[PDB]
Enzyme design. Structure first.
Site, PDB file in Angstrom:
ATOM      1  CG  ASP A  32     120.472  86.039  19.427  1.00 53.59           C
ATOM      2  OD1 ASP A  32     119.192  86.394  19.231  1.00 53.59           O
ATOM      3  OD2 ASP A  32     121.376  86.876  19.324  1.00 53.59           O
ATOM      4  CG  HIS A  64     118.586  89.946  17.769  1.00 57.80           C
ATOM      5  ND1 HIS A  64     119.210  89.065  18.682  1.00 57.80           N
ATOM      6  CD2 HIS A  64     119.080  91.140  17.848  1.00 57.80           C
ATOM      7  CE1 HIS A  64     120.507  89.920  18.820  1.00 57.80           C
ATOM      8  NE2 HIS A  64     120.221  91.054  18.731  1.00 57.80           N
ATOM      9  CG  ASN A 155     123.022  99.012  20.459  1.00 56.55           C
ATOM     10  OD1 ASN A 155     124.140  98.705  20.062  1.00 56.55           O
ATOM     11  ND2 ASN A 155     122.022  98.190  20.270  1.00 56.55           N
ATOM     12  CB  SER A 221     122.791  92.762  17.948  1.00 61.31           C
ATOM     13  OG  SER A 221     122.248  92.585  19.313  1.00 61.31           O
TER      14      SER A 221
END
Ligand SMILES: [Ca+2]
Ligand code: NA
Lengths: 281, 64
Positions: A32, A64, A155, A221
């Site tokens: 990430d 994130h 998404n 996520s």
């Protein structure tokens, strides 16, 4: 006082915690944007950066990776939130820069680092609309080597009868995770398709943010690390179970929701997954 | 209320920014290279613009 985010309760992680299992000695790579290791509600065991211009994996300039990490493994203490697998050995494998993006080669290098460093679980809350042979080879190699590989489905919502699942989630060797809310309804943004495997909470998920903060984020996520955390809980209770067995245990004990195009097998239930005999509830 | 801009594919990144800010003036626009991997969180205020090596829009812009 510590708070338990609703998603951790919803996947039945507290049932494993009450049995005495919290992910101890399980190595989980969060691949990430980095993880803020200074956060008092996180303990980062190690890591590496594959981003040429951001060489410190323990500095998260986006936020994130730190949020995703807190869902996997925020510490069990008297502060902040509780993670799904609060004793897991958490590794910051930085492959995305501050802007949220990375080159395919950086992600592949991160997966190769994870395999070389004997990670038990990889979480990838990331992806793109096309695959590459080299990307598929890296995830297939991780799975062949015994790693549980979990990724966010994307998404992209619906597009008629077309799959909108991203890569690497879309590869058969990777568990692709969609998002539901607290009522078990699919989030309107959650990607769909025959590659959708299971769902987890992905709406208004409270977790750790850099600079000793917390906040509610949305996305597949946020759903993915519930499943990566669940895999660590399962392995902490059954340390000889292979990745194959961990994956089957999660798939075979979901609470079924709607049609599998939209919901896959349904919501994960880590209490049922971590039993010896599996069935859906 | 517009959330996708298929008509901007193949336009310059400049024109895309202009058009998106007319429809969604508070948008947080971020320009990224097409064919990168990105975070999969959902941000209702964000519009990512994926550009090719010529700085033209290479994918349908959408909110998220
Ligand atoms: Ca805590
Ligand atoms: Na998959």
């Amino acid at each position: 006082a510590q708070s338990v985010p609703y998603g951790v309760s919803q996947i039945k992680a507290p049932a494993l915690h009450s049995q005495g299992y919290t992910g101890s000695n399980v190595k989980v790579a969060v691949i990430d944007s980095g993880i803020d290791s200074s956060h008092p509600d996180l303990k980062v065991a190690g890591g590496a950066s594959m981003v040429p211009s951001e060489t410190n994996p323990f500095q998260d300039n986006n936020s994130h990776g730190t949020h995703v990490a807190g869902t996997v493994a925020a510490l069990n203490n008297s502060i902040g939130v509780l993670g799904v697998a609060p004793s897991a050995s958490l590794y910051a494998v930085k492959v995305l820069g501050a802007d949220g993006s990375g080159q395919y080669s950086w992600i592949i290098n991160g997966i190769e680092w994870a395999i070389a460093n004997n990670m038990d679980v990889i979480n990838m809350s990331l992806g793109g609309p096309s695959g590459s042979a080299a990307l598929k080879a890296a995830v297939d190699k991780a799975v062949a080597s015994g790693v549980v590989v979990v990724a966010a489905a994307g998404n992209e919502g619906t597009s008629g009868s077309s799959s909108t699942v991203g890569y690497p989630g879309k590869y058969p060797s990777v568990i692709a995770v969609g998002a539901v809310d607290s009522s078990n309804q699919r989030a309107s943004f959650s990607s769909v398709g025959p590659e959708l495997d299971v769902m987890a909470p992905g709406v208004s998920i409270q977790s750790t943010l850099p600079g000793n903060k917390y906040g509610a984020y949305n996305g597949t996520s946020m759903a993915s690390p519930h499943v990566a955390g669940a895999a660590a809980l399962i392995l902490s209770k059954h340390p000889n179970w292979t990745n194959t067995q961990v994956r089957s245990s999660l798939e075979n004990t979901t609470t079924k929701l709607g049609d599998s195009f939209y919901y896959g097998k349904g919501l994960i239930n880590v209490q049922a997954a971590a039993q010896h005999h599996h069935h859906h509830h | 209320m517009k959330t996708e801009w298929p008509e901007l594919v193949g336009k310059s990144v400049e024109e895309a920014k202009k058009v998106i800010l007319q429809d969604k003036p508070a948008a947080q626009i971020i320009v990224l290279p097409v064919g990168t991997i990105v975070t999969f969180e959902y941000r209702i205020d964000r519009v990512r613009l994926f550009v090719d090596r010529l700085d033209n829009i290479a994918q349908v812009p959408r909110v998220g």
